[model samples]
Target: TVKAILILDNDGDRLFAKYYDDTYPSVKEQKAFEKNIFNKTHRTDSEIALLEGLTVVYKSSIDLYFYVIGSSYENELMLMAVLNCLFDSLSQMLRKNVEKRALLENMEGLFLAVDEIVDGGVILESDPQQVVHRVALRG
Candidate 1:
């Protein structure tokens, strides 16, 4: 099971955030989760950080910051694998993946990529090939 997954940026603009009932139940609660997580972790050089009492593992790709929140016992390596799957999947598609405007233009594409990675709050495989095989997100 998973708690939540978020994709934002260094500055904390909420581009995408998926919160499971296991973690958030209201908009305020969701914002709390988002704010706390980014506030605590974004300024640091480290990727594995703490947030909302859970350990948050994160990685920066292009301008977006991808994160996975789970129990304190969560494995950072596995968490990063999820993040990488997300990043590389987009990288595989966007041809010009790192451009400042690329991800923003295809935000839905990013959503579909992550949805396939963590569905029903289950951490799916980290294979970039698996991501490539999924149905593409809409415009």
Candidate 2:
């Protein structure tokens, strides 16, 4: 199962975060974990990392950061596939603009898109076209 999906701005502030389990129960702990992950990946070229014993796969857009996390033993490609689906669906929804400002203005759609991709930590869709279609239909 996917542990979490985190979206943060370039400065490491949370844009959106969904933790499926009790790994970081409190809001404070979650923020701290976000900072830790951002600090490690924001400037790195590597797309995969092991932090707090969890596997993290991340990608950055113009001013946004995306992370898909799972257990340390989890397959990286699985998480990456989810990450790509998310970005692609958003790209379609936002018309190729998946930046901070656009995302903030359209948070509702973001929530729908994410939910379509993953439900209760279980990935439901890996195809962006299908995810986008679902989100459009729901909207």
Candidate 3:
């Protein structure tokens, strides 16, 4: 049975986690399952590093997720950028603790990749009617 789904990165060489809902018998075992999944799918050392850094940040505070989702679209992007920055800073701080140096470097790259994703989503809000008419009248 297929228990989990995978998301492939833009390059088609890397895979990222999207969601998993399998029931585990214990928290420790669950953590082990997650780690194994990550290790199997992530293509680069950096991807793994970023995932670990994010896990730390997330464990530190779940409030960040709530704050990001609660904000308006523009604000959401801003908040995402802030989160990326925070992750990058935290990664630097924890680099020595990470077993793989390549993972640390990958975490930095993940931060930049996240910044690009946020930037791509950012746009000045325009009148919906104007937008619709412009597209409708385009030759």
Candidate 4:
């Protein structure tokens, strides 16, 4: 299952963040978590790791890094697949420019994509095409 998804700037400031479950109870706690996560993993070239007993999967685009946090038991391959699904979908949505400006401009679409991909930290769908199709059907 997933835990949290976050997009952070190069300076470790959160640009976008979402938590489906109550992983952290307070804002301070959440900020501290984000700070720690960013500090530990942001500068590394490794995309997969066990941090804080959570599976960390991430990809960098321009000045930002998009990340998915999952439990230690979560498969790295599956997390990577979802990460690619997210990246591919967002790239297409942003016209191949997955930068902060594009993401912010298309925030609504990004939210919809996230909604279709996962729910309550569980995989709902992983194919970008199917996710796009599902969203189109809803609208």
Candidate 5:
């Protein structure tokens, strides 16, 4: 299960951090800011190797945005894979189950829940023009 969502934005000058906790932290700490968007995901070995390059650019680039949603250990691996897939193509090692409604529903909830955080100001906005869309599966 997801416990928190953290959004970091490095807008050329400094790094801005935002976090949303479902059970902890005060509810008033979530807000949006202005920044740039840079895509960072590790899909291939080459991509993973490029982390240094990406991080270097991230450190120096002004108006950069980094969005992160935190989860429990059980979901960490899956979340990392999801991030990679979002950046690149789905790997053959990816598993697809046809009858796992619960899992699917949970994934939907994950996105929806995160959106709530974003909407609630728990996830800061780095770019005013940037938008996040969440689509949940209907039964």
Candidate 6:
């Protein structure tokens, strides 16, 4: 099952961080984990990482970083699909402007798009078109 999805700025400050599990229950713990995840992922080209016994799949845009995290035993490909769906859905909604500035400006849409893609760690939509369409209905 998926654990978390995070969107951070270039400096690793959280723009959005959603947790579906109780892995990191407190904000302090959550921020610590985000720091570690960003440190390990921000400067790397690899799309996947194993951290704190968890699996993380991440992608970077102009000034934004996106992460979809699951258990260590969870399928990496599934998390990658969520990552892609989120990035692509926002790409469409932001008019190809998937950077931090654009994202902060359209924060509500981003949250709606994410909810449409994943619900409590379960995959809802893998297709960006479908995700975007659903988000449009709500926003």
After superposition, the stretches of candidate 5 with alpha carbons farther than 4 Å from their true spots are 11-23, 27-62, 67-72, 82-139
Local accuracy by lDDT, each model: 0.72, 0.91, 0.31, 0.82, 0.29, 0.89
Could you tell me which 10 consecutive residues in candidate 4 have the lowest summed lDDT? 37-46
* lDDT (10s digit) by residue, model 1, range 1-139: 5677887776776777887654588888787777777677654323776666787877665576777777777787777787777767878878846433787787777777877888877887789878767835333
Which pairs of residues collide in candidate 6? none
TM-score of each: 0.82, 0.96, 0.22, 0.90, 0.27, 0.96
Model 2 alpha-carbon drift over 4 Å, by segment = 43-46
Write out the backbone clash pairs for model 1.
Answer: none
- By TM-score, how accurate is candidate 2? 0.96
| Model 4 residue-pair collision total | 0
* Clashing residue pairs for model 3: 46-106
lDDT rank order: 2, 6, 4, 1, 3, 5
Better-scoring candidate (TM-score), 3 or 5: 5
Count of clashes, each model: 0, 0, 1, 0, 11, 0
lDDT for residue 10 in candidate 5, whole number 0-100 = 36
Q: CA shift at 69, candidate 1, in angstroms?
A: 1.1
lDDT, candidate 5, equals: 0.29
The RMSD (Cα, Å) of candidate 2 is: 1.3
lDDT of 2: 0.91
Question: How well does candidate 1 match the true structure, expressed as C-alpha RMSD?
Answer: 2.6
- List runs of model 3 lying over 4 Å from the truth: 1-25, 45-83, 91-139
